[PDB]
Design an enzyme around this catalytic site. Structure first.
Site, PDB file in Angstrom:
ATOM      1  N   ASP D  17       0.803  -1.228   0.000  1.00 38.61           N
ATOM      2  CA  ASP D  17       0.000   0.000   0.000  1.00 38.61           C
ATOM      3  C   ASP D  17       0.837   1.279   0.000  1.00 38.61           C
ATOM      4  O   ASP D  17       0.555   2.228   0.734  1.00 38.61           O
ATOM      5  CB  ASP D  17      -0.966  -0.004   1.186  1.00 38.61           C
ATOM      6  CG  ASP D  17      -1.858  -1.224   1.200  1.00 38.61           C
ATOM      7  OD1 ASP D  17      -1.800  -2.005   0.228  1.00 38.61           O
ATOM      8  OD2 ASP D  17      -2.625  -1.396   2.170  1.00 38.61           O
ATOM      9  N   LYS D  82      -7.678  -3.857  -2.269  1.00 37.85           N
ATOM     10  CA  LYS D  82      -8.270  -4.487  -1.102  1.00 37.85           C
ATOM     11  C   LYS D  82      -8.942  -3.445  -0.221  1.00 37.85           C
ATOM     12  O   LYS D  82      -8.581  -2.264  -0.230  1.00 37.85           O
ATOM     13  CB  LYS D  82      -7.208  -5.257  -0.301  1.00 37.85           C
ATOM     14  CG  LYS D  82      -6.152  -4.371   0.334  1.00 37.85           C
ATOM     15  CD  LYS D  82      -5.071  -5.192   1.032  1.00 37.85           C
ATOM     16  CE  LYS D  82      -3.972  -4.289   1.569  1.00 37.85           C
ATOM     17  NZ  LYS D  82      -4.473  -3.415   2.673  1.00 37.85           N
ATOM     18  N   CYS D 116      -1.216  -1.900   8.193  1.00 32.66           N
ATOM     19  CA  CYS D 116      -1.300  -2.888   7.129  1.00 32.66           C
ATOM     20  C   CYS D 116      -0.126  -3.863   7.129  1.00 32.66           C
ATOM     21  O   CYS D 116      -0.328  -5.057   6.900  1.00 32.66           O
ATOM     22  CB  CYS D 116      -1.424  -2.192   5.767  1.00 32.66           C
ATOM     23  SG  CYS D 116      -2.960  -1.239   5.525  1.00 32.66           S
TER      24      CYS D 116
END
EC number: 3.3.2.1
Lengths: 198, 198, 198, 198
Positions: D17, D82, D116
């Protein structure tokens, strides 16, 4: 139990890849060299075998002269030229298994903390050895990679010691016959500052 | 489980080699002396036995006056003279087994973190003891060897505590009848700063 | 395996003795109050039960007004007054066992790290609970005893987390019906800087 | 044995990410980008598959152009969008299971360390994977949360490595045919300052 006791008859000194090319590039190299020589001088005083290694010695040189002169006196030294990053090449492994199978404690010095030292450490742990990283005597191109490697080795089971702590661990008693000359070596070692003591 | 609970019934205070010759040489020694004295005064309040040791007294001197004066009032104290770096010399171990087999928690103070504190800690853990290193009551000649030794002991299982945290652990409840005088001790202890707090 | 996963159905927030007496004694106290208040607010959005305690409330005062006001709207709160340093007094432990035995993950906030937070953490670990210490929302009178206590708890198995990290573990998915309000909380939380971010 | 050996045949690279809105928000983002690109290039040289995710891509943006352009050179790349904070969404997990079930070592990069990266590491550890966090290549909005998460992940069994250390142990041997181009890649990487080296 994970105690990391150190006995002279069960211990061996490893010096990894202290070459002349890495002079002027390793973080706090003078401390690494001075500390490693103290370990080598200790190896003589307590009859420790020394395993010295070079990485691509043809294009990267040999061991620096400061330790090379110190290693001449030591009774049991074998120098291995390798190109695996880990010191645990089949030749070194055979040396340990064939000539000193009772020594399962390795005092680990040299550079780089995060390349040759780390990979030697993991292979030594894999083979059932106790790994004692002499934090005084290991470093890398950057301080970040040195501190990272110490903790990365610790979380795998390696004991992180220092020159003084390892040597007094091997001495174990001031009433031993060798304590007087151990103290002289420690006193001389203290005349130079530790570059990592920030 | 590795909880490191502290009960006064099964606890004992170790004071390692806080001797005169280290005055002016050890990193933050006044904080070590002051913190050790608080632990000794705490052992009187909670009725903890105290084991004191001296390393080669005829050269390094006797225990510092400030601690030796505080050790006069304690009910259960024995002082041992030793040459082994570890405190677990057979005379000391004979005391633990024949006088207090029920006490398996050792609160450890003294100098140096990396020589006699460390080797005491390893030997105690070998015999099944719980070792609580009073971190603000141990030190070495350099800050580097102190910090290294604390993590080196923690990696073997020793609990790293402090004067306040360990004392409050032993007290366990403010409603206990001893808390009024334990509070007075803590309040006096806080009148000086911590040399390690930076 | 020790993963320390956080699920709202099996989690509960603990708030340890954030009382007015400490408004003048605790290192980085404003961050402690602010981070704890964010945890209480998150407990409301995620339907987490909250257990608050006061140490000697008759003398040390009640919970700070900033937190007590935020506790009014929380659906499931139970405030206990104690003299035992650990939060796990029999009345508290009865509440967990009788009314929420499925919740074995504890989010730990409050003061002091090394006295009441630590003794709560050790007692909870003894009973099989997963303890998540919210390092953002715990402190001591000195920074030394906070950092000591954090590692001392981790050494026993306590998960050392933060306000952002624990909240986002509970809010598993951004497509959940809770994400939008949870984001409004985090953005509000970040408006005032974390004093520990040094 | 928690050694964490890294083998190119059983290793896979994760990039979490690194999107276009966290520019100006992530602590030391340029170092995170450079370090990840070195990992991505190393994966190409060592034939390691690469998995990249974006969180809420439509509103947070695509992967940063610096890394996006480098992914154009790697053949074995899969990019997923996602909502779940963890990378181990069913689409990603199915890619691992049905296309590389023999690869159980993961090199983890990206942002954020505590949201994350952490949840990906916990889910990966739960599935029997070795997780190697490339500490060089992870960061959060604050330095505090990155440092916390690194130890929060190490505490659960994740190996905390670096770009240089992870790559060199993947290469394993200086006589391997790919070492020359790897050494060039390392040489370029050593020339960029480490934002976390301070």
């Amino acid at each position: 139990k994970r105690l990391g006791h150190l006995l002279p008859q069960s211990s061996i000194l490893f010096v990894c890849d202290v070459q002349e090319v890495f002079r002027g590039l390793t973080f706090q190299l003078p401390t690494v060299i001075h500390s490693t020589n103290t370990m080598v001088s200790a190896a003589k005083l307590l009859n420790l075998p020394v395993v010295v290694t070079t990485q691509y010695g043809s294009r990267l040189g040999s061991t620096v002269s400061e330790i090379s002169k110190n290693l001449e006196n030591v009774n049991d030294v074998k120098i291995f030229d390798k190109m695996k990053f880990s010191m645990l090449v089949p030749e070194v492994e055979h040396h340990l298994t064939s000539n000193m199978p009772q020594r399962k404690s390795v005092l680990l010095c040299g550079i780089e903390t995060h390349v040759c030292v780390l990979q030697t450490c993991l292979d030594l742990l894999d083979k059932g050895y106790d790994v004692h990283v002499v934090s005084d005597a290991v470093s890398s191109s950057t301080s970040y990679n040195r501190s990272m490697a110490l903790e990365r080795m610790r979380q795998s089971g390696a004991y992180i010691t220092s020159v003084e702590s390892a040597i007094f661990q091997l001495a174990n008693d001031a009433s031993n016959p060798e304590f007087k000359i151990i103290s002289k070596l420690i006193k001389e070692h203290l005349k130079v500052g530790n570059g990592f003591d920030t």
